[PDB]
Amino acid sequence: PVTHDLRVSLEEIYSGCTKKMKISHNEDKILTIEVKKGWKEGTKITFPIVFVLKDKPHNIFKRDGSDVIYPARISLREALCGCTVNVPTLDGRTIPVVFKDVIRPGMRRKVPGEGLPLPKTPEKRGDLIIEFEVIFPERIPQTSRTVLEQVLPI
């Protein structure tokens, strides 16, 4: 009744992949493992041994079921005065997504259909969620404080 962790990258989950696994008991044998589109953490593939699919951490995206989250690290200036976010896609395109209104700390903007394939309807994808991280200045001179007091509301 034996489990071993099968680590799968976001890209593997987006497109599917085949994974080959070596064993010894004492004959060296190969178990092959089709990983179909959009399969979730925990998914069990058993072998008369139980491979349990784990999401490999990715540094651009955080998986949220079939959705994919994108941290957008912008300046406070960008957040107050406007900016363009070049959203990366899982297949390596970039989408400019223009923001005219004030962006708020932790604000989300759904980029529809740029997520993972939903396992059972893999022609239907989840979403890419922009998640804004507004980076404050470490320090503000007395010069700036005095202007900021005049132009920002009480």
């Binding site: 034996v2 080959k20 070596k22 064993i23 010894s24 008991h25 004959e27 060296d28 190969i30 041994i49």
Partner: peptide, 27 residues
């Protein structure tokens, strides 16, 4: 029971062994 991931390349070479072993034991 020792398990470990293989590359496409590693995996081929290792079948050529369980094969080129089931060759000797098929004698």
């Amino acid at each position: 029971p020792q398990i470990k991931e293989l590359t496409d390349e590693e995996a081929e070479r290792l079948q050529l062994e369980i094969d080129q072993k089931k060759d000797a034991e098929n004698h």
